[PDB]
Amino acid sequence: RPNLVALTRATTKLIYSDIVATQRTNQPVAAFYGIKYLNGATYAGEAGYVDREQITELTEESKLTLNKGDLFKYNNIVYKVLEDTPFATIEESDLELALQIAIVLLKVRLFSDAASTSKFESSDSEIADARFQINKWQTAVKSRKLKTGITVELAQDLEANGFDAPNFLEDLLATEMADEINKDILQSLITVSKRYKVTGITDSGFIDLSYASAPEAGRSLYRMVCEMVSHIQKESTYTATFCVASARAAAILAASGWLKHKPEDDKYLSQNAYGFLANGLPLYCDTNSPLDYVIVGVVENIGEKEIVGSIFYAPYTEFKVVVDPESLQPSIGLLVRYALSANPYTVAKDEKEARIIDGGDMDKMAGRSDLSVLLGVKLPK
Amino acid sequence: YKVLEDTPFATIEESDLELALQIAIVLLKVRLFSDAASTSKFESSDSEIADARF
Amino acid sequence: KSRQLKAAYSIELAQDLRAVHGMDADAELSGILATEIMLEINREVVDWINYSAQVGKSGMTLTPGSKAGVFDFQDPIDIRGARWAGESFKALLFQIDKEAVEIARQTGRGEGNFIIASRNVVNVLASVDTGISYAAQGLATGFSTDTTKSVFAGVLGGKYRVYIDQYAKQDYFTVGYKGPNEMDAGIYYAPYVALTPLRGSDPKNFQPVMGFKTRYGIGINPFAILNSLGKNAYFRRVYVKGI
Amino acid sequence: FDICGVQPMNSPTGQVFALRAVYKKFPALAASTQTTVGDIYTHFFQETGTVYLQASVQVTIDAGATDAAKLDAEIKKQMEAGALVEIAEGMATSIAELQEGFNGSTDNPWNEMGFRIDKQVIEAKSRQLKAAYSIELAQDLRAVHGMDADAELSGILATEIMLEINREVVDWINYSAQVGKSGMTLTPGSKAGVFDFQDPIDIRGARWAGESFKALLFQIDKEAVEIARQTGRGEGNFIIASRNVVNVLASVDTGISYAAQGLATGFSTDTTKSVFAGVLGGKYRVYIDQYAKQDYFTVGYKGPNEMDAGIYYAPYVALTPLRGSDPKNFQPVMGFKTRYGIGINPFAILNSLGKNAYFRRVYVKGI
16 A cells, blocks of 8 residues: 555654664564574584583683693683693783783684684584574564544644645654654663663763763763673674664763764764764664663664664554544544564573563563663763 | 562662652663553554644 | 444454455455344344244143143153154144144234244254255355355245244244235335445544444234234244253 | 365464454232233242243232232242243343333444454464385385385375374364353253263163264254354354264265265275265264264354354465485485464463354263
């Protein structure tokens, strides 16, 4: 139905379709796809996993009993020993750092397991396992409806304004609908995003830039936003691709040089973007949530497939406008339905848990995005 | 907002309810709630409908 | 006198029917709705017959050991000493003839020509006379190519057209007479308006309405609905137990 | 296979439509009152509560019967006389029409057609089977005997899958079917749920199998009616039953169904182990459950519309081949898979036990 297509485009062109994965349905439920996994370095292969097990855990009492040519692993990374007794020259007591030092000082080497044909065919070895798993789930298409096209005495007003009124009002209906759609997405996004946390949450409590705390320049928030992006780069396998924040959170707060006010709107920036941050990511402004928060996350794709996201959107058309001539008041209604969800497998150990939940159930998906984080922010008022 | 687990705000010292709520939402004690619902709900119940905001 | 129904259904139902299977939605819903109003008017006819019918298995139609208007298959008298279900079922048909007879006696026009009965009763009667009451077996053969639950099963005993009261409430049969002349029915229905479509929606959800209206009026042999309850000689009704 | 709606999936989840249905103070009879013919009165008997009584005779009920015991006696005498006829719901029904008719007004309460019409979300649940055969068999089956080798195994395998799924559909029918020969379909002296051919009550005093077998048919009709009543769609159209039951039914009305006469006449030409045997009495299409565990029958309804089945099978993928080998000895791997999903009217799939109005399942003993 071309009229639903036109109404869809005239409505969804106004929502943040670029901060969520977009999929589509044609079914009462949407079949959503996504990718989840347990990690974040080197190989995922079993032959290699066996070697890790068969070489050493690199315990503190054994780190220096190793000598040139030996292998060891730590936090799933295989390293070779360069010269004798690695770490025996490093004063650092924390093995993780002692290792970082050992790599820098060329006491150990990040070990590459690329190998010859001989290694594989001779040992009749295993093959790398998947770093990723493909998930699928279904979420019901939910809906909302408007009865906002007020006509009656208003019909006469609309006739007086008949130059534009027929379509004008439908465009207005779409505008308010888009507003509600976008807000729905944002609430889900706020909920699913993981809390960004450092030392017990953003340097031991949510960042606070209130009058009694740090009413600086907004620079400290920008510092934490940049760290949120780091977190995504560290834990995810892509890079943050978007950021959304309220005005008080960042869309205005960062306008002290940490935010660009849409200098141009056709290059690396969508039409609904507020602008973009000094650390990148198109910035979208929420404006509704009382939290004044910042969200950093990843929406991505494999070729044409937008399978990566915290939130997945899947509209169902066959965006319908209906007119009912009740009395002398032939009002206009607008009906919109779509599925909206997060990948349920991020809250499940296996399919016997994932299959008994709904990716659209934000009570369970709360804080379990893994492709996004949120910064709580306490602001002056 | 929907309540996540029991007694939301039990652990929030903040006396200003507006802020206590910002805290509860971010700590996942409460959840921003959407009224989006099944198609069945809306027609079956002969429900109401959004009026115009503007 | 009129009667009307509404479709009462969602947009999403129609959208999903089309989006999912290419179904015509409203068109199918309409077929159901038209069918339902026809079933409802047929119920009205039956309900009036079961109102106006005189109590059967009474007076002239009693077996000396009988229970007054009720045929109980667990009672040797009602089944006239029958043994086993087959013989007992035939005994019911025999009571039906007695009712048909009383109709002839009081109407002065003739023996009952049709039977209206509950599904259990129809099965009782359909189980006798070899195959007179038909199952619409061509439909069963093809795995329900239709069910056509809108027809008479057949003419029992070679005497009575028998139709299934699809909405029977207790368990029963009623016998009635109908002559060649439309003026010799004892009950009348006179279509003025039929299956006039209705259209609309409910603005609170803007959900669609379709529907059907009829106008027909009804009537009775006056016998003087005040003058028909339990009074109309053209019809006799019996409660059946024990099937 | 042919007794369910299909509305085949073109995606798991996925869903199947069903026409789920939408889901009087008579004056007391008393001493000294002369009744009016056709009028109906309420009378409470000291024993067995109340009935409604309809006058056939304008009789004064013993004006001296101020003693409820005497009043009951006179009324019973008048009932014996045929003066007063006894019916309960049947009269409540008549008066309800009386009242509503007289109290009628057009207003605008258009009544809805009594249908809800809804759909279940259905996952295209899958099942499979493999051939597990050797090279040597394949070589010899063709080379020596002129067989099509693995092609024949493929035929057999695919058939077994097809039948295994039909079997599972039946298990779900039996699971959800309501207990038959219960409630509305019981003989007062019955055993509540099992038709035992050694029980004179179930067989209604039948003389040998000829009559006893027909008595089973009569129980089958009762089930068909209860189904009709509860679904609002009409009598059951088909029977799923055990070998003992079908053998019994086969003997009734001469030529209702296959007793493998095609196969025997043809001297083992085609076993056709995928079809319904025929139609009982010309009324119920009947299938032989080759996997029946004990002895039973289930009566069910099916309309012309897939959505008028009450049960659904929605094949998505069927008898789709797989090919491979095990290089250690290279014995071939061949097999087939199916995805279909299964549905049942919700009656508000694991939670449908004993609720399905479109089906009634009765146990059978004594054959």
